[PDB]
Amino acid sequence: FFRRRRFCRFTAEGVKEIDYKDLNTLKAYVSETGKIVPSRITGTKAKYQRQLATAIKRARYLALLPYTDSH
Amino acid sequence: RRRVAAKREVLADPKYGSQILAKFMNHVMESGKKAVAERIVYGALDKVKERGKADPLETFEKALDAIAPLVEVKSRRVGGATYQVPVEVRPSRRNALAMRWLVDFARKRGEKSMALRLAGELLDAAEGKGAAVKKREDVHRMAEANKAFSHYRF
């Protein structure tokens, strides 16, 4: 039920407009290499999974998160 | 191919008291001529006792283990490429490989007095200069060129 509670990581709270600033949240959703996790592993609702993917791609642009283990 | 094959046993050598020599005697017999082949194996046994003071069973015990090989190839074809695989020779099989190599090189020795042909074969393999020992080690060299195919498409 670990994939069930992470659906409530955004829906149980009123944190609907997520930001690209809380890196302590976003590092839970990024794998060890750098690529972004699926949504059948976290089990988050697909409204927020689309909203989660934008905050990664903006934080990646501002060099707050890497791409690969190369750089 | 249901597995069927049981085991039949031949172990009889009363005039010397041996077991390996009786199985070796069967590889010399042609068309059931047992009494002919019996006096030739003893005929090439006493010439070693004439030659060496040691008991010639142990000369025969040493001459097996310098003709008997360890690994050999096995051409198992993948069905589109002909490969060969060096395989470990089973411990039961490795006795008969030496005894069958030994007789076939005795027949092309090209001497006189037939029991002297087999006499010279058992003398060389206690040293290593026999043609059976040279045929042993050459197939050993074929495995390491084949050693790349040991597990992979094997």
Partner: protein, 115 residues
Amino acid sequence: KTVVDGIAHIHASFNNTIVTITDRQGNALSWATSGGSGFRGSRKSTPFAAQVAAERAGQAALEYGLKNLDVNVKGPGPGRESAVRALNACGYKIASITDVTPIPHNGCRPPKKRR
């Protein structure tokens, strides 16, 4: 000449495997290939031949010392992990093992499909 704590580069294609021992500066010390060990064909692509060429690079590396190695593995082909087990067989302290793999995000288009 004396250098220590070198870097081992391993390049593994579908037909050949090239191993190179370098420094932190990225300078050649000893290179060794699967074709130079005398295989040249279907035997060339085997992971056994990636052990023969691996240790042979590990013998001209003791000219300069190099008691510590850092391994970068690169390529899709077989012998990708068999070459690492043939490194400390020569007696080298392997510190860390690292995948380097060129993966284009979109990239140029590859050649066409075989028939």
